[PDB]
């Protein structure tokens, strides 16, 4: 309820800011604003994926197609959100390089600064909505959206700072009379412009930005992508389980121990444990289940192989 | 061995064509060629992800970190490849729109056509290498690479066709004397050009292209993303398993059956099956294992709950 409400609220603000970008571009007759609107549509797609994962995760319930439920679906949502962000971060890095090799002037700096401030306010509102997620499957699913919100919030901050630096320290050649543009090599033409450091302010910061994101993206793409690989949860180690099951009387060996994490705090472990006396099997198995519960594994399947 | 050889060969050709693009851009002094080279670097990243998945999938061995192995890692590689491709298809769609709202002229059509033909030859070689995959994971990891190769091969075909149509049917205004450019609205300026249909040839085809890719991408993103959700394999249905286990004498009920697919043809099913007589448990369990093998489930775990 609360999570879906937050996601729907952020989606609604994202459409509203999309409409704001479109109408502002229409009055100003600018196309890069439309491109930024379509990037906001990419953000809409990320929010939609998060919403799909969050609904479907409620199924739980033993269905015919999935006997476990659909909480792992939420986990997958987190995972896919993380991979879309690694990808958009890599696209930002490739755009930054493309702007290093060819700088781009910013036209109409004031409206760009205003739209950047509006987007910063929207992204800060979204960040406050998603602050609680810096049980777990919910934490991962909300962390994906939180990382997307942090990414486009940092983008808004970069845009605002760049627009301010352009408006305060860039002397353009758009006047049209006796102006030479050293930094931007060919001003499309068949005084001296502003210092060349400003024209590269957008790329460098962007690069720094993606690094930040990549850093903060790495745990999620680590945490979500190891649950679906059925890696043993970090709280659980296999040596202690093996030795404690071997120390239990009535246990000859523990031939095949499989431990994995379904989603969040639901850890599933199945083992085969050899026993000699069928009569003692029930108390041996209850002790084994007690050990599994002691170490935090609550759903188990134990097959006794009488010899 | 063979799969890693194919992946390394395609990676080597991809670096060689990257170097070709870079050197051609250097002699021609063109920047969009560098952008295409960085897109080829994105293809390099996809191939690298595939290589990592393939290399890690050969571990198995029931590592301490993962008691099942790392074949699911290969599955995840397939999945992430699919996701990456969907994202690039959506970026192509957003670039196509950006070119619909603002068409772009193609400069130096002959060198673009030649580089497109070279890339088409490289991509056809890669497609022939990956033709065999239109175990199962081996297929999924390669189908991911096959879809990437098909995508940039279709991109090369689009580039070649567009360059040919420009060279044959576009009358540019680059001569500099008495030329008006109706289609491209402002030719950056403070006769009649070629017909306006050519300037939009690249977007429309691109859109069609992504549709194709998206279509062919959907099964992979369906097939890989349902294995990691532990959905029951399509060959297996739960009603027959339940009824056949109930019909077995000595079985009171099958209380929990979870059946899922690890990777490829390795299907794992665990169940609880209440039995009355411990003496009859061994033959009852061997019959149950025989049924599980009969339906194609070879790794099981069956816990008898004596009452
Ligand atoms: Zn066994
Ligand atoms: Zn039970």
UniProtKB/Swiss-Prot annotation, chains A, B:
Disulfide bonds: none annotated. N-glycosylation promotes endocytosis and degradation through the proteasomal or lysosomal pathways. One of its GO terms (molecular function) is metal ion binding. One of its GO terms (cellular component) is basolateral plasma membrane. It catalyses: Zn(2+)(in) + 2 H(+)(out) = Zn(2+)(out) + 2 H(+)(in). Keywords: Antiport, Cell membrane, Cytoplasm, Cytoplasmic vesicle, Endoplasmic reticulum, Glycoprotein, Golgi apparatus, Ion transport, Membrane, Metal-binding, Nucleus, Phosphoprotein, Repeat, Transmembrane, Transmembrane helix, Transport, Zinc, Zinc transport. Residues 28-31, 96-109, 167-193 are extracellular. It is found in: Cell membrane; Basolateral cell membrane; Cytoplasmic vesicle membrane; Cytoplasm. It is a multi-pass membrane protein. Residues 1-6, 53-74 are cytoplasmic. Belongs to the cation diffusion facilitator (CDF) transporter (TC 2.A.4) family. SLC30A subfamily. Zinc ion:proton antiporter that could function at the plasma membrane mediating zinc efflux from cells against its electrochemical gradient protecting them from intracellular zinc accumulation and toxicity. Alternatively, could prevent the transport to the plasma membrane of CACNB2, the L-type calcium channels regulatory subunit, through a yet to be defined mechanism. By modulating the expression of these channels at the plasma membrane, could prevent calcium and zinc influx into cells. By the same mechanism, could also prevent L-type calcium channels-mediated heavy metal influx into cells. This is Proton-coupled zinc antiporter SLC30A1. It comes from Homo sapiens (Human).
């Amino acid at each position: 309820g609360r999570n879906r409400g937050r996601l729907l609220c952020m989606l609604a603000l994202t459409f509203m800011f999309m409409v704001l970008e479109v109408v502002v571009s229409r009055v100003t007759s600018s196309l890069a604003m439309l491109s930024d609107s379509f990037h906001m549509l990419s953000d809409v797609l990320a929010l939609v994926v998060a919403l799909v994962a969050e609904r479907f995760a409620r199924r739980t319930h033993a269905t015919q197609k999935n006997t476990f439920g659909w909480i792992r679906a939420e986990v997958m949502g987190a995972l896919v959100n993380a991979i879309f962000l690694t990808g958009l971060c890599f696209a930002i890095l490739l755009e930054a390089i493309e702007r290093f090799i060819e700088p781009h002037e910013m036209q109409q700096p004031l409206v760009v600064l205003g739209v950047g401030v509006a987007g910063l306010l929207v992204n800060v509102l979204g960040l406050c909505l998603f602050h609680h997620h810096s049980d777990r499957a919910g934490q991962l699913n909300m962390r994906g959206v939180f990382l997307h919100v942090l990414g486009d919030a940092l983008g808004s901050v970069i845009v605002v700072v760049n627009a301010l630096v352009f408006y305060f320290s860039w002397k353009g050649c758009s006047e049209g009379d006796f102006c030479v543009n050293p930094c931007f090599p060919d001003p499309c033409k068949a005084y001296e412009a502003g210092p060349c450091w400003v024209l590269y302010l957008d790329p460098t910061l962007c690069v720094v930005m993606v690094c930040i994101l990549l850093y903060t993206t790495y745990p999620l793409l680590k945490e979500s992508a190891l649950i679906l690989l059925q890696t043993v949860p970090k709280q659980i180690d296999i040596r202690n389980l093996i030795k404690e099951l071997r120390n239990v009387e009535g246990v000859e060996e523990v031939h095949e121990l499989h431990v994995w994490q379904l989603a969040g705090s639901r850890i599933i472990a199945t083992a085969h444990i050899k026993c000699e006396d069928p009569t003692s099997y029930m108390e041996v198995a209850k002790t084994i289940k007690d050990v599994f519960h002691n170490h935090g594994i609550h759903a188990t399947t134990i097959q006794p192989e009488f010899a």
